[PDB]
């Protein structure tokens, strides 16, 4: 009965033309509010691409109210904190602005490009670490390249510094559950597919240090993947767009893909995570309210 609950939504950032949201973003705002009202949520994780298509200009940019506050304004969301990280489109604009906005909106929590969250599951001593990454400063901005793959970071020292931080943090983490989150995927069968930078540089750390799951967006669909070590991959990038691409199906090792939903007639959806002392589970919920897939992930034990 002790439980931690949160929604993970990716790539919800509306549009820069009025009315500054899509039909899909509005459906997911309503669907998330209903989920929060009916099942509860202790917080919401944004998996990046918070403001399409070029982010915000500064912390008083009106897109913060137009695409974020006014869209996710249903009353059940009133007191629900958001923990945010950046995607590639955010980085085309002013990312310091989205960090500074944390001081303007109470529920907006974005203290740094990368940072560590730590929770105690209520009514228990079980602990959860969530490391929020900036995969754009780690790997590069996909929008810098015709390939739309982050081929190289713009600043080597900045990339190597975050990698060192992740190394040291994951080797020291004592929590029962360790989640890692970033915008770009490790594995994905869809339009961008796997990020070579993360597969080479992040995935060995996730494996070595017994991470429960990596959460991401960036590909505009819903996927669950799991490798032969039981490391889970929660891809939730369907807050604003639905891309049915299977372009990179053959770039993901056979068997890793356990669930995929990208139907273009869908309004999108999101992932709902529940963590108890017993186990972690993730439910993929469509913007229509239908449960699409649910699976459990183990307690790492520590």
Ligand X SMILES: *[C@@H]1O[C@H](CO)[C@@H](O[C@@H]2O[C@H](CO)[C@@H](O[C@@H]3O[C@H](CO)[C@@H](O)[C@H](O[C@@H]4O[C@H](CO)[C@@H](O)[C@H](O)[C@@H]4O)[C@@H]3O)[C@H](O)[C@H]2NC(C)=O)[C@H](O)[C@H]1NC(C)=O
Binding site for ligand X (CB under 6 A): 57-59, 94, 96-97, 100
Task: Tell me if 74 is assigned to a ligand binding site.
Answer: no
Which of 64, 108, 114, 256 is in the footprint of Na ion by CB under 5 A?
108
Task: Tell me if 196 is assigned to a ligand binding site.
Answer: no
CB-nearer residue toward Fe ion: 85 or 170: 85
Question: Cβ distance 222 to 269 under 8 Å?
Answer: yes
CA 11/CA 60 separation, integer angstroms = 21
Query: Which among 9-17, 88-96, 105-113, 248-256 is the span making contact with Na ion, rule CB under 5 A?
Result: 105-113
CB-nearer residue toward ligand X: 46 or 94: 94
Task: Tell me if 221 is assigned to a ligand binding site.
Answer: no
**Burial of 95 (C-beta count, 10 Å sphere; 0-12/13-18/19+):** buried
Which of 55, 87, 113, 269 is in the footprint of Fe ion by CB under 5 A?
87
Which residues face 273 on adjacent strands?
A: 6, 282
| Best CA proximity match to 185, nearest among 147, 152, 213, 155 | 213
**Tokens 């109470």, residue?**
106
Question: Cβ distance 220 to 254 under 8 Å?
Answer: no
Spatial CB neighbours of 2, under 8 Å, sequence gap ≥ 6: 121, 122, 123, 124, 126, 276, 277
**Burial of 264 (C-beta count, 10 Å sphere; 0-12/13-18/19+):** exposed
Task: Tell me if 88 is assigned to a ligand binding site.
Answer: yes
Which of 42, 59, 201, 205 is in the footprint of ligand GLN by CB under 6 A?
42
Task: Tell me if 49 is assigned to a ligand binding site.
Answer: yes
Q: Does 54 bind ligand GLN (CB under 6 A)?
A: yes
**Interface mask toward Fe ion for 24-63; x: CB under 5 A:** -------------------------x--------------
**Interface mask toward ligand GLN for 75-104; x: CB under 6 A:** --xxxx----------xx--xx--x-----
Residue ranges for the known binding site for Fe cation are 11, 49, 52, 88, 183, 218, 220
């Amino acid at each position: 009965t002790p439980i931690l609950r949160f929604v993970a939504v990716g790539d919800w950032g509306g549009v820069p033309n009025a009315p500054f949201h899509t039909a899909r973003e509005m459906a997911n705002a309503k669907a998330i509010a209903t989920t929060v009202k009916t099942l509860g949520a202790d917080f919401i994780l944004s998996l990046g691409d918070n403001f399409y298509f070029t982010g915000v200009h500064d912390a008083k940019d009106k897109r913060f109210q137009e695409t974020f506050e006014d869209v996710f304004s249903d009353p059940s969301l009133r007191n629900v904190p958001w923990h945010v990280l950046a995607g590639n489109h955010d980085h085309l604009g002013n990312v310091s602005a989205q960090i500074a906005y944390s001081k303007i909106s109470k529920r907006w929590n974005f203290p740094s490009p990368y940072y560590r969250l730590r929770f105690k599951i209520p009514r228990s001593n079980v602990s959860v670490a969530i490391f929020m990454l900036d995969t754009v400063t780690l790997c590069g901005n996909s929008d810098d390249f015709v390939s739309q793959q982050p081929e190289r970071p713009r600043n080597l020292a900045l990339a190597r510094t975050q990698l060192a931080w992740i190394k040291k943090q994951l080797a020291a983490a004592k929590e029962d559950y360790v989640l890692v989150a970033g915008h770009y995927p490790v594995w994905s069968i869809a339009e961008h597919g796997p990020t070579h930078c993360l597969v080479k540089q992040l995935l060995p750390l996730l494996t070595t240090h017994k991470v429960t799951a990596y959460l991401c967006g960036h590909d505009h669909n819903l996927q669950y993947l799991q490798d032969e070590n039981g490391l889970g991959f929660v891809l939730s990038g369907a807050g604003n767009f639905m891309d049915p691409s299977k372009k990179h199906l053959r770039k993901v090792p056979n068997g890793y893909l356990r669930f995929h939903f990208g139907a273009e007639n869908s309004l999108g959806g999101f992932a709902y995570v529940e963590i108890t002392p017993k186990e972690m589970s993730v439910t993929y919920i469509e913007a229509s309210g239908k449960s699409l897939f649910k699976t459990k992930l183990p307690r790492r034990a520590r």
